[PDB]
């Protein structure tokens, strides 16, 4: 019926996702990935739950910061969409690479 013009819903969800404080990432897949990565360095380890929570918080915060930086990079080139060139630029400048 009423077909929404694209972009307006995309413009939405900034209000709700900037006031929310949730983790936005599933718990069990993340814990399985953490255990998979830790399997390489040393076998037969056990993980504290609080450590997993803190890891998740740090990781999501780092991704949010990187996305902010790459958005600011992408708006420069008179474009609106993100391109992996922008990610490469952002990690190139700030000294991570």
């Amino acid at each position: 019926p009423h077909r929404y013009r694209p972009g307006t819903v995309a413009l939405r969800e900034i209000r709700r996702y900037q006031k929310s404080t949730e983790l936005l990432i599933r718990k069990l897949p993340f814990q399985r990935l953490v255990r998979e990565i830790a399997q390489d360095f040393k076998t037969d380890l056990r993980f504290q739950s609080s450590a997993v929570m803190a890891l998740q918080e740090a990781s999501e915060a780092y991704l949010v910061g990187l996305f902010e930086d790459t958005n600011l990079a992408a708006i420069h080139a008179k474009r609106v969409t993100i391109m992996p060139k922008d990610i490469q630029l952002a990690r190139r400048i700030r000294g991570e690479r």
Partner: protein, 78 residues
């Protein structure tokens, strides 16, 4: 294989909180790679810290020590 545990909607939600309108289809693999490399970069120091103490479990203080080593201080877990 567990790197595919991060589906597209999670990445889109993170990007929306980052403040973006439109994302291309090539972003997901780059985000996955950056996430993964960050994980081993932290976990290496974490496992070293927990190994020096002669234990078998990574406490939260170890993770906090690992994060502060790289200059990314985290508050909330002592």
């Amino acid at each position: 294989d567990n790197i595919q545990g991060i589906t597209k909607p999670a990445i889109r939600r993170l990007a929306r909180r980052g403040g973006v309108k439109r994302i291309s289809g090539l972003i997901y693999e780059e985000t996955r790679g950056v996430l993964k490399v960050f994980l081993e970069n932290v976990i290496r120091d974490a496992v070293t810290y927990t190994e020096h103490a002669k234990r078998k479990t990574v406490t939260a203080m170890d993770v906090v020590y690992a994060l502060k080593r790289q200059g990314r201080t985290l508050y909330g877990f002592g």
